[PDB]
Amino acid sequence: GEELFTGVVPILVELDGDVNGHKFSVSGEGEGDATYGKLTLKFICTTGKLPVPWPTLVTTLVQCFSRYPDHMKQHDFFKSAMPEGYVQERTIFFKDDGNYKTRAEVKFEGDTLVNRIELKGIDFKEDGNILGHKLEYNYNSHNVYIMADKQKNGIKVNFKIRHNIEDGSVQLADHYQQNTPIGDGPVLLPDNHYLSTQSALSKDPNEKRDHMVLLEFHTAAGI
Ligand SMILES: [Mg+2]
């Protein structure tokens, strides 16, 4: 699977969402260079205005582009499942507010890495930080904790995202994640480790549609 990632790979992302009954779609395009753990993508809301803040969708919108150091490469589940791919499922609990449930299939279509997602959000507060659009347009750096889930030939992942609030406070988003292979071939089941992440959000000055431009780095560590 790793041999598929030694150069620059085109990426496509397609999401359909429903948050408290607000339906929307997002399309993204860009490229990944796993040698450097690097992603660059632009996302557009194709149905109009996004009903939630862009930062809340970053984690949902391709961990196969992480840089695994050579001494840890036997622990890279994500690339080992390729090209047939993996199912990535999450529950994201926004503290004092609602939750997202997501199901994604990540796989190659030809030479392009595709991430196709369905997202469902329930129990959000109309005047909370999500539906109230009180989150700053920025993004923090995190540690993503990974363990083997041998009963499903996959992995279990957990981490805390910190979203800055416009009043100086922080909105926590606790992430619970599971990944299972789509194919029935062998995968790399890892020892406990983590991914170190950093991300920068920006806007395309000429773009009038609701959108997000993102630069992200993901690097494995801990063994
Ligand atoms: Mg071991």
Side-chain angles (χ1 to χ4, degrees):
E2 178 176 348
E3 60 171 18
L4 296 174
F5 291 93
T6 53
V8 179
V9 174
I11 306 169
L12 300 170
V13 185
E14 294 291 333
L15 174 144
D16 290 330
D18 174 341
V19 173
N20 277 34
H22 301 279
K23 295 183 170 72
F24 63 97
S25 306
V26 173
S27 298
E29 302 177 24
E31 77 186 27
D33 196 352
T35 296
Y36 309 97
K38 182 176 183 181
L39 301 171
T40 49
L41 288 99
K42 175 176 169 190
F43 303 94
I44 299 169
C45 182
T46 58
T47 52
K49 208 174 307 221
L50 201 68
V52 297
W54 279 108
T56 71
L57 300 182
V58 167
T59 53
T60 297
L61 294 167
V62 291
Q63 295 173 310
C64 52
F65 288 103
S66 302
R67 183 178 76 75
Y68 268 76
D70 181 82
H71 75 277
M72 292 184 62
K73 278 178 188 195
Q74 295 310 309
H75 302 272
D76 187 352
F77 166 88
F78 306 99
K79 297 185 188 56
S80 80
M82 298 296 161
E84 298 83 7
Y86 52 78
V87 176
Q88 181 159 299
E89 300 168 272
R90 298 215 178 87
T91 304
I92 304 166
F93 295 99
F94 293 90
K95 188 174 177 69
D96 200 46
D97 212 332
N99 61 84
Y100 297 161
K101 289 183 182 70
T102 65
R103 187 185 184 281
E105 296 178 6
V106 187
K107 69 176 140 197
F108 277 91
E109 295 293 344
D111 291 334
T112 297
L113 190 284
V114 178
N115 183 18
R116 283 188 52 131
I117 312 128
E118 295 175 81
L119 177 152
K120 187 70 161 282
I122 68 173
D123 283 345
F124 287 90
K125 295 176 172 168
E126 301 250 6
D127 201 22
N129 293 319
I130 295 78
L131 293 180
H133 294 267
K134 308 184 192 184
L135 299 183
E136 300 192 335
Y137 189 72
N138 53 33
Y139 214 83
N140 285 302
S141 299
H142 305 103
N143 294 322
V144 171
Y145 297 98
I146 301 174
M147 317 178 331
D149 182 354
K150 300 183 141 103
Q151 311 183 308
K152 309 202 204 183
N153 203 34
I155 59 170
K156 284 174 165 152
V157 181
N158 75 267
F159 56 100
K160 294 176 187 162
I161 296 293
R162 300 172 314 286
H163 296 298
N164 288 2
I165 308 165
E166 68 192 359
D167 64 358
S169 186
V170 56
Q171 169 68 72
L172 176 70
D174 286 293
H175 284 57
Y176 295 86
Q177 167 185 346
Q178 144 183 296
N179 299 57
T180 55
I182 291 166
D184 84 318
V187 299
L188 298 173
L189 300 177
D191 277 298
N192 298 359
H193 68 282
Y194 69 102
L195 312 175
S196 174
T197 67
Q198 75 174 70
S199 305
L201 316 186
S202 62
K203 298 289 184 183
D204 172 356
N206 305 321
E207 185 54 77
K208 292 154 175 197
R209 299 174 287 179
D210 204 357
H211 73 284
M212 169 173 71
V213 175
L214 166 75
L215 172 64
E216 285 217 316
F217 296 94
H218 314 241
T219 309
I223 286 184

